[PDB]
Nucleic acid binder design. Structure first.
Ligand SMILES: [Ca+2]
Ligand SMILES: [Ca+2]
Length: 725
RNA sequence: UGAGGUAGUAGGUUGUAUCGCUUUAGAGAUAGCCAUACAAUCUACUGUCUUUCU
């Protein structure tokens, strides 16, 4: 089926244009940037129980810098959620227009390989480092302040002590004797990443140092109580001896092994702050009594990389993917006005749920459903001077089906730019400077499969974001650019008396004829001066839905689309429209040949409600209450604000009752009280001339209600059943 | 913050069955938006258990 959720198809991953053809070249200008980490949201000690110090990225002065051959356009300050709290990352230029030589540039490239292959462990048999066939390639090099304090410059005395050390890829060859006892230097291990030598010869385990335990010595650690001392442990399990028995033990904690840092660990998947209320004493006791690795400096080789830069390196996958999460492919916004929405907002008009990062596609597309319906409806109602409700409902439903929405999103190119998968850097991320998967002589490193429904939903969320930001001219221009055309959008013996009603509603009509149209049938032909109240019911149902949805969206209560649509249906049900049209006296001006239809419900409501239904609901009472809205709208130069001004006094107590009482239909609530045994019997005409429905739930007998149709009959039966429960 | 497994919570996702509301074409049908119950599956957190590391 063309727009079915089932029809999945395969789609590649687009490359931000700035991050392609981006390899630095000899005698080619570079653009040195800076990641710009600054810890502007520490974590609280009422929220952190690691029992471990916080490390701001400002304690030290060496930082990572991209070296694209292409200029990066400034991106909104985005956060990453490291061990030390929400870090606001800012990729802001540091220097530009300088030329490098060959030797230093090959040094840069070798350090880039060392970083992604050796440091981050993103090397797989399938992936081969080729920075000349790769599709996204740029160096990631360290920066420091030397000479002038203001200047940040490429470290060359660093990146040259990585080529003069032999503890980088292997373990240094060293010889310790009892005649030259091992000597300890505190400054060397102050910020150190240490690798154990006695084990994991294939792939060693890295751990940055975070403390020095001075009281702890090689003779008293006893961590696992089956061993007489610490030194005897290396001696029996590895047969290693120590030449210095007065050195301290070197407390230590792992390098981060999971490199998805775009989500917070102790908050919801909603962007909502929520600390846990359980294990409060236990979390502190946990990191206290838990086994913790206490290495020894004798046997651990110090990397040529200090912890202060390893900490900025670990965050490079997430930072280089969020900068890549179309933040730099804001070409969508360049193609699409008050300067457009923030690229942070457009990244919620491309992110689909089950991408689990803190943005949902929905709660922004529901508002898009109401505007597109309203825009299509208004465009039709004014495109043609004559069309019955059947024709317009036909035309509309074709221009707004999921099939057509899908066929318009994919034509734009929206499926590659989307975010459909969860971020796993080793499994489905292709790091920069790496050529697409092959080493073996469909793939998860450059393709993804998305349903046809999801393109049709993002085409809605994008409209929602442009709308809620730039107004209602921007949403219309956006749709018009997709392809959906929305932009080119005796008679004084029964008209006198409308002055009282106009004074009741506090609006005066520039042309009274619209009030007349809003009150005459398409079968009552005594009034031939004006047209039927049928086209107006169409515009008014769309508008009163758009306005109610915009109000509901603008509330700080932040309703999920489920509750939002439940409310929208709770107040646009035509029973309420009948009640509000008879309360404020719409019927007394309403010319019709209805014999006794609305009189019963009028007396019913005016007697019982003096501050569910036991009587039939007139179609007219419900449809005049919302043809008046269309009449105001079409009279007041197509202005939603006069309509909302006139209608908000009436609807205000109703809205502030329903946004707290959130009503629902008796049939659905019955099938939610017990769906196992509840079912409606097929229609069958009784001896009254009615239609009856037989309903049962076990234990309370059988229920029924006669009506003029199957829907009304089962509704009455459901009410009868639900009153007893 | 080593590789797993097993329960719960939170956020999703897929399929299937019963369904609500708005629109109307001539049990029920067209086109939109949810909810509910069962099942499969993924991510983040907490605890518990095995292995490893200290
Ligand atoms: Ca939709
Ligand atoms: Ca209607």
């Amino acid at each position: 089926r063309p727009g079915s959720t089932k029809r999945r198809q395969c789609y590649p991953k687009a490359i931000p244009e700035c991050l392609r053809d981006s390899y630095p070249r000899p005698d080619q200008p570079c653009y040195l940037y800076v990641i710009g980490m600054v810890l502007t949201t520490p974590l609280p000690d009422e929220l952190n129980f690691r029992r471990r110090k916080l490390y701001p990225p400002e304690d030290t002065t060496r930082c990572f810098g991209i070296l694209t051959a292409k200029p990066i356009p400034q991106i909104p300050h985005f956060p990453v959620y490291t061990r030390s709290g929400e870090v606001t990352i800012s990729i802001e230029l540091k220097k530009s227009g300088f030329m490098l030589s060959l030797q230093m540039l090959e040094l840069i490239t070798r350090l880039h390989q060392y970083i992604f292959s050796h440091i981050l462990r993103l090397e797989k048999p399938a992936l081969e480092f080729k920075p000349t066939d790769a599709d996204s390639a740029y160096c990631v090099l360290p920066l420091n302040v030397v000479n002038d304090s203001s200047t940040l410059d490429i470290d060359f005395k660093f990146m040259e002590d990585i080529e003069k050390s032999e503890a980088r890829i292997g373990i240094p060859s060293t010889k310790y004797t009892k005649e030259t006892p091992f000597v300890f230097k505190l400054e060397d291990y102050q910020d150190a990443v240490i690798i154990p030598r006695y084990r994991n010869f294939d792939q060693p385990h890295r751990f940055y140092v975070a403390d020095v335990y001075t009281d702890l010595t090689p003779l008293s650690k006893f961590p696992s109580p089956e061993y007489e001392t610490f030194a005897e442990y290396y001696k029996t399990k590895y047969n290693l001896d120590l030449t210095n028995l007065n050195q301290p033990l070197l407390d230590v904690d792992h390098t981060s092994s999971r490199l998805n840092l775009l989500t917070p660990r102790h908050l919801n998947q909603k962007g909502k702050a929520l600390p846990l209320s359980s294990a409060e004493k236990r979390k502190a006791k946990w990191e206290s009594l838990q086994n913790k690795q206490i290495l020894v400096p004798e046997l651990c080789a110090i990397h040529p990389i200090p912890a202060s830069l390893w900490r900025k390196a670990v965050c490079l996958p997430s930072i280089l993917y969020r900068l890549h999460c179309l933040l730099t492919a804001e070409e969508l916004r360049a193609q699409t006005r008050t300067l457009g929405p923030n690229p942070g907002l457009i990244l919620q008009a491309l992110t689909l749920s089950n991408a689990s990062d803190g943005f949902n596609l929905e709660r922004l597309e529901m508002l898009g459903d109401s505007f597109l319906k309203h825009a299509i409806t208004t465009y039709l109602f004014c495109t043609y001077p004559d069309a019955h409700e059947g024709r317009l409902s036909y035309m509309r439903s074709k221009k707004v089906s999921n099939c057509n929405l899908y066929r318009l999103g994919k034509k734009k190119g929206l499926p590659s730019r989307m975010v459909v998968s969860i971020f796993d850097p080793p499994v489905n991320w292709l790091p920069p400077g790496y050529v697409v998967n092959q080493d073996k002589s469909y793939d998860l490193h450059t393709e993804q499969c998305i349903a046809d429904k999801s393109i049709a939903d993002c085409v809605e969320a994008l409209l929602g974001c442009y709308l809620t930001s730039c107004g209602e001219r921007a949403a219309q221009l956006f749709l018009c650019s997709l392809g959906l055309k929305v932009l080119p959008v005796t008679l004084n013996h029964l008209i006198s008396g409308f002055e009282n009603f106009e004074k009741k509603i506090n609006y005066r009509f520039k042309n009274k004829a619209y009030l007349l149209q809003a009150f005459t049938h398409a079968s009552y032909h005594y009034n031939t001066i004006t047209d039927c109240y049928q086209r107006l019911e169409f515009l008014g149902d769309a508008i009163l839905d758009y306005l109610i949805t915009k109000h509901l969206y603008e509330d700080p209560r932040q309703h999920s689309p489920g509750v939002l649509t439940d409310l929208r249906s709770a107040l646009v049900n035509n029973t309420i429209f009948a009640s509000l049209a008879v309360k404020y006296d719409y019927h007394k001006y309403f010319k019709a040949v209805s014999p006794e239809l609305f009189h019963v419900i009028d007396d019913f409501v005016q007697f019982q409600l003096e501050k569910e239904e036991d009587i039939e609901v007139p179609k007219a009472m419900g449809d005049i209450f919302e043809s008046l809205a269309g009449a105001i709208y079409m009279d007041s130069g197509m202005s939603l604000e006069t309509v909302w001004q006139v209608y908000y006094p009436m609807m205000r107590p109703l809205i502030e009752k329903f946004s707290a009482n959130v009503p629902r239909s008796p049939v659905r609530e019955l099938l939610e009280m017990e769906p196992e045994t509840a079912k409606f019997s097929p229609a069958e005409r009784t001896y009254d001339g009615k239609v009856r429905v037989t309903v049962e739930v076990v234990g309370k007998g059988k229920f029924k209600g006669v009506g003029r149709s199957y829907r009304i009959a089962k509704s009455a039966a459901a009410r009868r059943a639900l009153r007893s429960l």
